[PDB]
Design a protein around this nucleic acid. Structure first.
Lengths: 35, 85, 49, 154, 73, 157, 153, 46
RNA sequence: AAAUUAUAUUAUAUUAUAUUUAUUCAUAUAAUUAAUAGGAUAAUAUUUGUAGUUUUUGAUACCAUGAUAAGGAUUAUAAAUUGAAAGUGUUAAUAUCAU
């Protein structure tokens, strides 16, 4: 999940319009769950 | 509580000389098996004195903090006073 | 002003705090001979290394 | 098999309630498919189990909406009809895994755990080197060494 | 330089020979001991200028005999 | 990256041989090396160390270090021979620093050889003039190297 | 009042004297133990009968010292100075930095004498090594700062 | 002690073994006497 | 008879029935008092068992504490954001050892 978020943020930084589907899929979204 | 740090600290045939005894036989007897200096006489000896040949040979008095060893034998020779009681 | 506290101690107060305390003579650490290879670690017992 | 200890039986509803942890763990479900694919056997109840739990894990974090009230019990019973339908397919794969594994273990000369039955070799529960010196439920003394279910020459 | 690097294994790092003298309580005796140890290390390392028998040996990772050589076994 | 087990399972209720659950001392774990530390029953100096977490963690760290050592030594197809500075090849005529002293040194950046000198392994058959001057009979045969420019089956001829 | 009863002051002062006797006796006892319990030869000069005679003589010297402090440090390292409550080192009944019990630490927190920062009771505070690896990693980091950063000479 | 000396041998060097030399003062944190009580070398306490 | 408040997960237990041990308990014990004192590179005090004796460890009480359980209202008219979550009020029983 962390790897997916890193790759998605890198794709958003490279091409800006990639943020339009990638935010809709929830890949740029951070959950706060600890142990 | 930490591991084996309690301030207040058994028959076994294959582990006779290795259970609650010194690890090596090269080492000497402890301090209570010898006289340090000028003494007026001790009421009791410590539990870590090794029973030697002269304990069962002479047999003047054996007082362990009580405990009275009045039955001398040679199966106790080479072992401290912990497992003898 | 009514409540002015300076954030820099003035030069007079630094000079007064410097003028009241002495210096340590071994802070100069000057050296021109070399190291005593034989004696300096074998000196007198009260002042020994 | 190197697990020869005495075991504790579990009901099948507690196995499937683990879900993605042990029952539908994806590494475990893949190597169950390699057992069926080796024998020339279609993996249809296993593919039925995977497609159900793939979609079941997808919405498992969503909260169910509050039902304000229905006159008849039809949408509640339909949601319960599909719920007990999904348990019975997963009950079939739970039996299909235990059926084929005990059948393969009879072919590979694999000795099972204690009180475990292999249909070809040991109709009773095979017990070998238990802490209890006798058979736990046949009430028979165990010989030394353990019972050999197969022949010798590998 | 090779003999000094081998004689001072971990005390040399990134082209700089460093010695941390902690032996005596005072720093003057510590810098005396450090100067003595530096001079002793330099005098031992200078032996490579005497001859080739003091040049330190290069450690080559020589392979085992290959399969072409093991085929003749 | 390795996917083997390193940590010890923690202390809890006495586990049973069920699904997703192994007992705390099983012969399957750590190659059976927990047989030294197990109690078969369902003297205090021989009973207290089997239940300490730091003791069992130190023991499994020792066993994983033994496994790492035997796998690093089974990788070795070579041995270290102390060769003098004159007879060594040109890549080793430099000042080689010690381990963990400097940056990991490339072999030859000028000759387009970017590789660690400490991982370089030289063939035995190319050093027979250095390692064996007293034999004089060529104890190892010369290594047959293939002609890369020869028209073979690899190049559709 | 007033500060603490005088029997507890006598007890803390006896603990300080035991620490001072440890500083007095530890080097001598360690050298005597390391000579007397060695089986390898001490040197090229002293070998054979001279080494065994020297080991017996240093054992006779070691046993003749009435009052030599051979007691380990962790047996009486839980003595509190302000109050008479006895804690256990290794548990939550003792704090190591200010060297008081849990009760005395709570009284000095509620009194305002110390400058301590409260943090959440299920976290690891603020130390990055403590959040990273726990108590053992900060233990190894204190070891790395104290000893292992120096190239010995 | 006279009956205690039979099974337990006597090793009595004397009080000379309790007083270390002056060259071993800084190794023993300034002390010379290995008594059960500490021994200060000043006359004001003494 | 609905809404779901529901935690849920797995394991253990006993004089089978007798034996060794970590703590607990019994009966034997050791330990006791008080106070200061500056020393190399300093323009000159030789000094420290000296000034202390009938030295300090001596007020556990009947105050009016505080914990427990229970019910209230306000905000979502946005598809954006890593993230649409936060503050404010009343009754019963129990209980109260500091001149």
């Amino acid at each position: 999940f962390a790897l997916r978020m890193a790759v998605a943020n890198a794709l958003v930084k490279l091409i800006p319009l990639t943020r339009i589907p990638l935010k809709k899929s929830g890949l740029l979204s951070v959950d706060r769950r600890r142990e | 509580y930490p591991f084996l740090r309690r301030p207040h600290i058994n028959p076994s045939a294959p582990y006779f000389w290795s259970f609650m005894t010194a690890k090596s036989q090269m080492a000497f007897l402890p301090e209570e098996n010898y006289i340090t200096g000028d003494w007026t006489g001790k009421f009791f000896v410590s539990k870590r004195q090794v029973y030697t040949l002269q304990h069962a040979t002479s047999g003047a008095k054996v007082r362990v903090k009580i405990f009275e060893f009045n039955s001398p034998s040679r199966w106790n020779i080479g072992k401290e006073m912990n497992t003898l009681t | 002003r009514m409540g002015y506290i300076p954030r820099y101690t003035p030069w007079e107060w630094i000079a007064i705090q410097e003028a009241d305390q002495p210096l340590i003579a071994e802070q100069i650490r000057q050296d021109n001979i070399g190291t005593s290879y034989f004696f300096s670690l074998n000196r007198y017992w009260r002042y020994k290394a | 098999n190197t697990f020869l200890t005495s075991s504790v039986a579990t009901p099948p509803i507690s196995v499937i309630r683990t879900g993605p942890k042990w029952w539908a763990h994806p590494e475990r479900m893949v190597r169950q498919k390699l057992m069926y694919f080796t024998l020339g056997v279609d993996q249809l109840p296993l593919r039925r189990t995977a497609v159900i739990q793939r979609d079941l894990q997808r919405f498992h974090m969503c909260k169910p909406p509050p039902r304000v009230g229905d006159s008849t019990g039809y949408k509640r019973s339909r949601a319960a009809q599909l719920n007990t339908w999904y348990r019975r397919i997963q009950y079939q794969e739970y039996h299909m895994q235990h059926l084929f594994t005990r059948h393969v273990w009879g072919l590979l000369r694999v000795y099972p755990g204690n009180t475990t039955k292999i249909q070809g070799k040991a109709d009773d529960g095979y017990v070998g080197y238990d802490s209890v010196p006798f058979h736990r439920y046949n009430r028979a003394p165990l010989p030394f060494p353990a019972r050999e279910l197969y022949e010798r020459r590998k | 330089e090779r003999r000094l690097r081998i004689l001072a294994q971990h005390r040399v790092g990134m082209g700089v020979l460093k010695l941390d003298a902690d032996k005596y309580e005072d720093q003057a005796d510590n810098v005396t001991f450090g100067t003595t140890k530096l001079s002793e290390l330099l005098a031992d390392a200078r032996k490579a200028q005497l001859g080739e028998e003091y040049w330190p040996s290069v450690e080559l990772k020589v392979r085992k005999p290959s399969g072409q050589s093991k085929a003749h076994y | 990256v390795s996917t083997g087990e390193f940590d010890h399972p923690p202390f809890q209720f006495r586990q049973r041989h069920t699904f997703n659950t192994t007992p705390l001392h099983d012969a399957n774990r750590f190659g059976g090396r927990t047989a030294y530390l197990r109690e078969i029953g369902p003297k205090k100096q021989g009973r207290r160390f089997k239940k300490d977490p730091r003791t069992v963690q130190f023991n499994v760290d020792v066993w994983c270090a033994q496994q790492t050592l035997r796998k690093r030594w089974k990788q070795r197809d070579w041995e270290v021979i102390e060769i003098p500075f004159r007879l060594v090849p040109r890549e080793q005529q430099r000042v080689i620093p010690e381990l963990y002293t400097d940056i990991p040194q490339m072999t030859d950046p000028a000759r387009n050889d970017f590789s660690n000198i400490r991982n370089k392994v030289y063939d035995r058959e190319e050093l027979q003039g250095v390692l064996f001057p007293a034999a004089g009979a060529m104890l190892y045969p010369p290594l047959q190297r293939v002609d890369k420019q020869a028209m073979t089956l690899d190049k559709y001829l | 009042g007033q500060d603490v009863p005088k029997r507890h002051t006598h007890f803390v002062l006896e603990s300080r004297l035991m620490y001072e006797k440890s500083f007095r006796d530890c080097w001598l006892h360690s050298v005597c133990r390391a000579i007397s319990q060695l089986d390898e030869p001490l040197s090229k000069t002293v070998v054979g009968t001279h080494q065994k005679m020297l080991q017996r003589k240093v054992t006779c010297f070691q046993y003749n010292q009435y009052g030599l402090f051979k007691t380990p440090y962790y047996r009486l390292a839980n003595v509190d100075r302000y109050h008479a409550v006895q804690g256990v080192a290794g548990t939550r009944e003792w704090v190591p930095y200010v060297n008081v019990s849990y009760w005395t630490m709570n009284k000095m927190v509620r009194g305002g004498n110390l400058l301590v920062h409260r943090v959440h009771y299920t976290g690891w505070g603020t130390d990055s090594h403590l959040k990273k690896g726990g108590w053992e990693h900060r233990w190894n980091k204190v070891l790395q700062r104290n000893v292992l950063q120096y190239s010995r000479i | 002690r006279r009956e205690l000396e039979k099974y337990m041998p006597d090793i009595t060097i004397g009080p000379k073994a309790l007083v270390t030399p002056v060259s071993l003062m800084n190794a023993r944190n300034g002390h010379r006497v290995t008594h059960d009580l500490l021994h200060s070398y000043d006359p004001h306490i003494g």
